[PDB]
Design a protein around this motif. Sequence first.
Motif, PDB file in Angstrom:
ATOM      1  N   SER A  39      -0.862   8.612  66.695  1.00  0.00           N
ATOM      2  CA  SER A  39      -0.596   8.599  68.117  1.00  0.00           C
ATOM      3  C   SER A  39      -0.877   7.223  68.691  1.00  0.00           C
ATOM      4  O   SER A  39      -0.122   6.722  69.523  1.00  0.00           O
ATOM      5  N   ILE A  40      -1.948   6.596  68.210  1.00  0.00           N
ATOM      6  CA  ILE A  40      -2.464   5.368  68.817  1.00  0.00           C
ATOM      7  C   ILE A  40      -1.473   4.195  68.844  1.00  0.00           C
ATOM      8  O   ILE A  40      -1.807   3.100  69.305  1.00  0.00           O
ATOM      9  N   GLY A  41      -0.254   4.421  68.369  1.00  0.00           N
ATOM     10  CA  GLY A  41       0.734   3.362  68.353  1.00  0.00           C
ATOM     11  C   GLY A  41       1.188   3.069  66.943  1.00  0.00           C
ATOM     12  O   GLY A  41       1.535   3.995  66.215  1.00  0.00           O
ATOM     13  N   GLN A  42       1.170   1.790  66.560  1.00  0.00           N
ATOM     14  CA  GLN A  42       1.705   1.348  65.267  1.00  0.00           C
ATOM     15  C   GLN A  42       1.181   2.185  64.097  1.00  0.00           C
ATOM     16  O   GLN A  42       0.097   2.766  64.182  1.00  0.00           O
ATOM     17  N   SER A  44       2.665   4.810  63.477  1.00  0.00           N
ATOM     18  CA  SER A  44       3.051   6.137  63.924  1.00  0.00           C
ATOM     19  C   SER A  44       4.084   6.721  62.975  1.00  0.00           C
ATOM     20  O   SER A  44       5.282   6.478  63.125  1.00  0.00           O
TER      21      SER A  44
END
Length: 71
Positions: A39-42, A44
């Motif tokens: 979820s936190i970004g990269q 993903s």
Amino acid sequence: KLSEVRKQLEEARKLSPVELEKLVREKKRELMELRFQASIGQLSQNHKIRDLKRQIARLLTVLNEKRRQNA
RNA sequence: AGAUGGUAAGGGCCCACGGUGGAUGCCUCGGCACCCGAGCCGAUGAAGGACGUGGCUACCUGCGAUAAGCCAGGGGGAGCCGG
């Protein structure tokens, strides 16, 4: 992956009741980390998340199976 | 001184030509009757819901913290991950 779903089954059905409980606990922790950082970004990445749920399921199923102590 | 026509601000009737408007004909995932079979669910928690659940999901449906789903057996034979 089918015969590896069967790797799960045939090689985690047949591996102790207590150690099975511990197994699925570990599994829980795994998925937690997954969905977490996914979820936190990269990095993903999808796929595996749902798969883990699938994985989880069978364990618990068979858990309860032999945890109903019947055969 | 006599003559008797005449333009149209706008109007009417008429035709062709548009705009709105939904008729009608035809179409049918739905509806209608009847006829036959079928006919109980629940403390094993029913009928029926609330909330949730998909990597991203507003609704619909699906499931249930094992959440658009797991296990075993049967079908079937090239596609699938809901609409």
